[PDB]
Design a protein around this ligand. Structure first.
Ligand SMILES: CC(=O)c1c(O)cc(O)cc1O
Lengths: 250, 273, 277, 259
């Protein structure tokens, strides 16, 4: 189902994104059409129950390594204090997790590449560039790096910084990833520019499936922010799934 | 289910050693110390079986396990007249298949850490003389050399699995009876070779998955369809040994670890089978 | 709460003989074999206390129990350096008053069947040689057990034990007994637990009932197989229990923890009713 | 956090007598001799502030304490030109509120045992007939002092700006010696609201010439005239004293305020 709500400022951004990407060789992947799968619609209408929230203890994070699904794979809710939580499953048919690793460095070296991923919300990305072409591993081209991002989440533009970390630092059983079909990850702290206020802890796990892979994402963020993040994640990662294999191939 | 409320002091140390050494194993996240037993077996924890409810070891008696439905005393324990003991234990495995049980019974035996997943508190060690052997052929005929707690103290035991036909089971009739897996064998004390148990595990297909029906004849006089082993004493001759108490320990032990296994067997089979 | 999942085989017989014996007693309807322990003590059943969490038996250490709030390791067990053991156990008695506890500690002691109410699985027998004390006029609740010796047969583990408990004035051990009321301590049951015959020390035992808004809380301490009664010399001629072949202070302390949590939580379920009746 | 490594010998005796005195008081539970200092002030313990880091006592200077954020030298000590001393001290009170601090500054004053909780080692006596007549150690020797608290505006603080500046409590006073009336300190305690509770920003002008917005008192010499007296040393003693007793109060103020 096509998205029915486009914040006014993103309506401007999609047009300026379209214009500046015109003559890039990956321009033909730029497509504003965004939609969310019928399977997630209920999650758009009702918050998760506190018995569907995953904790951040070593034990709870490693439950994601279990085959099959946990409760509340896709949804959002407010938490104790004004904190927030977001969960989101997105399927990537015809893709492999290696493509997800490659994507998470490749997009980060040009704002126009970043804009492919969410034409409406992605305004700017920068990194402080030798890493793109340094001789010799996909993970080594973004893990341990900081992505400076300017994007819309909801109506609000944000200026944030994401540093990607070895999942082991959070107590993930990294040695168990391969057996569990987890071929990619992207985990990090989301911090505000300047203030360095923590905004979210974020996990993205790419797990091999029969059809390709599936992306399982968790955000520990207020209640509003978690809802915007749910919409954001479903929108941009479903969008990425429509061209990731083709753009990886090319 | 109700959490276990009693953890012998030595096992409290073992569960921590086990947690430590299993770090960085690919199956580490299946290590979970939380153990419990289902409400439906609580009566069996509180009173022994009656003599009438004890299954014998003749071919006729063993083959009653192939009958549809259930027998008297599917779960319980009691002492037997010669100081021996008896344990029966039914454990449900929703979402699993007998194939998974067959797999588990060889796979776990090649690393102590795998063995520890099954009973985090009580399983200390396992080895076999044929590590080359890495479903039935992969554990039947094999001996598992085990160190584990079944009560307060660590035991060194040797479990050799056999073809159930050797004991008079209608092995041909297993398929028709819904028995898709079996693990039957003798449990001997390391060193003395004294018989700790004749042991039967039968996995019967159910609508939800399968159910494990287990029988143990503790400190018995002889392997089924055999003479007692000449020159080796019955375990009941050991001063201070109680077959009744040991049967109770085995009941608690079986219910604890096989219910534990039921909570992750389908998943770990998917990952590693 | 969570139901007990382990019943030693001899106690499975005992609960049945206890049920039979108590029939036609006036208090028979208080007999209930169902036993359970609170979620909050489960961590204590799974790992020992650290040595820093262990209270000593010096007067200064004992009187720490009068401090408001809690100490480290209110519930737990551990082994001690030279074969001895230690048990602490906190049990809540919602809806009860310390007076009921003083009453209970004499009232149960004059009939084995009353004693069986308390731990249906483990309590086999009790006797005292001053039966007159039960009905003597004008005695306080405390006067009816402090100074008395209870001869007890019970399970604290797999096997029956014959023990003798003599209840003392806590002042004898250096407790600021005159300061109990100010500290909200409304009842006590303290004494030495000795083995029948040998008179070896099985435990130095402290039970303090401290007033709460909900009722009271029972704070218990056991120093298992220790060498002397507090403020007293070791008794000449009698070996420490740790000298017995096969005795484990550590294991005994674990049994005492399970035993205390089981029976005092059980007592909490009916103490206010039986006191009322 | 690091335990104090230095206990003057008289205070070793005093923490004991305090321990005995308080035994059967309702609040005896809050008596704890353990005292420590946060890692962050350790630099302040090893070198004096520079002159540029000293706050003055004019209305504009005092009101700089209302400015958001921090000033130069939030924690430290130094000697001043006329032989006087200066102490600044920031102490965090996580879990607490300014109202608790207000409550404390009158509550403690009516029983010597209550005052004892605050600094177990140095606090010996207090009474009233506000003016607090105190016996305590701020150094090696027992001092008989008289602390009288005033309305901040009398020193020229922007009282109407306190709320907007997060200042939920204050305790400003003159500290005088018993008998001689010599001036030991001009003292300011400001409790500023923070995310985790509040922070106490203290300023002392030690052995100073005059109360703010006052002349010196006629016929009474400045304490800097006493033969063996050093404003510099006293300011260091006051820094240690302030960091010790206020970090200590922080460990039990919310609890004791509840009770
Ligand atoms: C009896 C028991 O504890 C047991 C068992 O029934 C099967 C097995 O493969 C290993 C074991 O240690």
């Amino acid at each position: 189902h096509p998205i029915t709500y486009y914040p006014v400022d993103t309506q401007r951004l999609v047009r300026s994104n379209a214009e500046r990407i015109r003559h890039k060789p990956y321009a033909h992947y730029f497509n504003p059409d965004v939609a969310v799968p019928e399977e997630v619609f209920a999650a758009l209408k009702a918050p998760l129950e506190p018995e569907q929230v995953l904790g951040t203890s070593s034990t709870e994070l490693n439950r994601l390594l279990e085959p099959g699904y946990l409760e509340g794979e896709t949804g959002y809710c407010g938490l104790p204090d004004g904190a927030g939580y977001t969960s989101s499953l997105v399927r990537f048919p015809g893709a492999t997790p290696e493509m997800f690793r490659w994507w998470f460095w490749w997009h980060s070296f040009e704002p126009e590449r970043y804009s492919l991923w969410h034409p409406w919300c992605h305004a700017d990305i920068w990194r402080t560039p030798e890493t793109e072409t340094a001789p010799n591993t996909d993970e080594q081209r973004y893990v341990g790096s900081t992505h400076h991002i300017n994007e819309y989440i909801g109506q609000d533009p944000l200026d944030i910084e994401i540093t990607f970390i070895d999942p082991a630092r959070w107590g993930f059983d990294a040695d168990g990833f391969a057996a569990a079909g987890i071929g990619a990850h992207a985990c990090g702290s989301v911090l505000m520019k300047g203030s360095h206020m923590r905004l979210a802890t974020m996990v993205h796990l790419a797990r091999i499936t029969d059809d390709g892979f599936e992306l399982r994402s968790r955000y520990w963020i207020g209640e509003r922010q978690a809802y915007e993040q749910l919409v954001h994640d479903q929108t941009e990662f479903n969008h990425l799934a429509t061209f990731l294999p083709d753009i990886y191939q090319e």
